[PDB]
């Protein structure tokens, strides 16, 4: 089934100050992560999937590849994750049961801080998704 979409914004309370948003997606589910859109006030974010060490430190590697590049806030931008164990796509994401995955953003929310390699809203606003795949 299709899980509730996660809109990546500062005015978005799913991200607890404590440990950020926590999800329990099951194998077969899909999830959209949407950039903040405005026909208001512009927000800019590069969103990466990362490992535990980067997520704790709110840092990004220079070879890391952003799932989402929210550089166009007037435009519809979105990433649909399919929680599959076996991708028919050579370049698709694969997940396994009882393993935790992480999405973060070390951009600070402004245009000039979009490329920030560390800190940002991961640090300040706890904008951090833990995905506990196949668990309770």
């Amino acid at each position: 089934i299709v899980l509730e979409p996660i809109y990546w914004n500062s005015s978005n309370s799913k991200f607890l100050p404590g440990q950020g948003l926590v999800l329990y997606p099951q194998i077969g589910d899909k999830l959209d992560i949407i950039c903040p859109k405005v026909d208001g006030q512009y927000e800019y974010y590069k969103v990466y999937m990362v490992d535990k060490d980067q997520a704790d430190r709110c840092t990004i590697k220079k070879e890391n590849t952003p799932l989402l590049n929210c550089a166009k806030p007037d435009q519809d931008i979105k990433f649909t994750i399919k929680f599959q164990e076996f991708s028919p796509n050579l370049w698709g994401l694969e997940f396994q049961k009882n393993k935790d995955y992480y999405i973060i953003s070390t951009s600070n929310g402004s245009l000039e801080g979009l490329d920030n390699q560390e800190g940002g809203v991961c640090q300040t606003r706890a904008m951090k998704i833990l995905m506990k795949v196949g668990q309770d």
Binding site: K30, E63, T65, P66, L67, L68, N69, K72, Q75, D76, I77, K78, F79, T80, I81, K82, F86, S87, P88, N89, L90, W91, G92, L93, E94
Partner: protein, 178 residues
Amino acid sequence: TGEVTLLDSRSVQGELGWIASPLEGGWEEVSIMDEKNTPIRTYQVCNVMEPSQNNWLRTDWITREGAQRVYIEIKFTLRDCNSLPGVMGTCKETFNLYYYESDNDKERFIRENQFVKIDTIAADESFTQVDIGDRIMKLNTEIRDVGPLSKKGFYLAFQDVGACIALVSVRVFYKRTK
């Protein structure tokens, strides 16, 4: 770089939202991080253990821009079916490409018998393991053309008959000065 794009699925940042029959359990839309380290919109189906597969995917209406001969570039991958749990047999390694000319830009449903078969497209190569880091160019690229086209625009459709396949990108273009 001497060819005008009539459609590129990679340019769509929100969603393609193409119509599919069945709408669930067949072709499905997912994002990937592509060769250019850019998130794109893709379509895939992997019902290899299920018999009598007839999964149809159909693009939005594409304008010709008055070009009577149009080229269709499909980049796709095929997951080796024997890399999947339980699947013992011979793998389906093809899908079928169709088209339908129409002035109507909002056809509601996939009418199977109204589509004309361009060709059966074969996977030159399959894969067994997803690529983690840097994208290695092992995707299949197949180009076909259709024409002379008579009407304002047309639809492309893909029929899966039980392969484990991902359409990485679809690019429809005409050559500007041949």
